[PDB]
Amino acid sequence: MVYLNSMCHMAANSKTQQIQGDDNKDDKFPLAAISKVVTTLWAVDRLGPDYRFKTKLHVTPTANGSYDIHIEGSRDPLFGRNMSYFLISELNRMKITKIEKLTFDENFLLAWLDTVEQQASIVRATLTSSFATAISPGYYTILKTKAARIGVQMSNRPKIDVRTISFVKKAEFQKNEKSTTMVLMSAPLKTILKRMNNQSNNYIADNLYWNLGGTEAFNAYIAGKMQADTSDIEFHNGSGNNEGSVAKPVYNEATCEMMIKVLYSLDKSLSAKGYDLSDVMAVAAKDKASTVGSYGGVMAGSTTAKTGSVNKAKTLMGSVSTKNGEIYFAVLMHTDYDKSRSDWGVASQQIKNKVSQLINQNGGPKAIKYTEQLPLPFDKYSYLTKA
């Protein structure tokens, strides 16, 4: 069962600022991963698009010749394989190849994809597998080549040998007298958001949402920002994934109007810092690693957008650039993908045809100024630096 729940839009240049749409534009529907755009807005407002996550390494020489290292985490929600490979590269550039005790605190988050001890157990497990495995030359080579494109140098065939990896809480970490402290800054937040909104599992959005205070903080933010409450927008996580079962699902939900208000606000907060939607959201046809990279037709090169797919919904929202100006849009479809596998692709085609009509009946597409960015978790200021 594929059918329209709601479609709405507004011209960026509207003097009335009245959102246009069908009669369902003020009823709540599942959002799926367009939720990530709301999480994006929150993060931009709270942190700023140039914010960097400052992970600290406390490094102490051992009588051996080797090092102990304690990671004081910054809750960087994008510390994954790429970033781990870069850390290893950096350790080798700093002449560290052997670590005796590697320790890490509760703020050191790791994306291989409850409670503090148990969360840290999973990070430890992941770390121990990852650092005890040879770095894959094919994956590293591709990564080193992407890094060189943004002028980041990485080591040749890097490696690390770690004796032990343990959880040490921030409160119980005693900084050694002859430790050095080095900082490994993330790429800017806008870049992390770019990566998240191109294509991701739940991990980044969910960790951002928790970092910022979770649901109680989110509802206070939305009330302050939008004069909105839970009848406009009801979140349970940052990502929009199912928090229930297949039979009784629990999805983030919002009105079509709220999605437009989000896009407007996001656009405004970004412009204040000189940035565009296409700095944090995928560009149809241009962003090849995204869910809209194979979009063609009039959307190609003209459209900034985020996809969503859950059992009960297929969604799209963003901005289309037309000869009549930029236009914010959201389309929310109903699906029953658990019952009928064909619904996601059928829904997706109906959304594209709806957005193509929105473009084609507003004078046709006007290209945006955009060249495919590579949203790596580090940039040229990420190098280990003695702070």
Author numbering: 38 to 150, 165 to 438
Quoted passage from the original study:
Here we show that Bdellovibrio bacteriovorus utilizes a small ankyrin repeat protein, Bd3460, to protect itself from endopeptidase activities during entry of prey. We demonstrate that endopeptidase complexation by Bd3460 prevents cell wall decrosslinking, and that both the Bd0816 and Bd3459 targets bind this self-protection protein via a common epitope. Previously, we assigned prey cell rounding to the action of two secreted Bdellovibrio peptidoglycan DD-endopeptidases, Bd0816 and Bd3459, that act to modify the invaded cell wall via hydrolysis of the structural 3-4 peptide crosslinks. In summary, we conclude that we have identified and characterized the first ever self-protection protein encoded by predatory bacteria—ankyrin repeat protein Bd3460 from Bdellovibrio inhibits the prey wall decrosslinking enzymes Bd3459/Bd0816 and in doing so protects the predator from the shape transition that this catalyses in prey.
Structure and activity analyses of DD-endopeptidase Bd3459 revealed a highly active enzyme with an open active site adapted for prey peptidoglycan diversity, rather than self-wall maintenance (this was also inferred for the homologous Bd0816). We next utilized a modified version of our original Bd3459 construct (starting post signal peptide with K38 mutated to become the new N-terminal methionine) that represents a more ‘native' signal peptide-processed form of the DD-endopeptidase6. Upon comparison with our structures of the uncomplexed proteins, Bd3459 does not alter in conformation upon binding, whereas Bd3460 undergoes further flexation around the region between AR4-AR5.
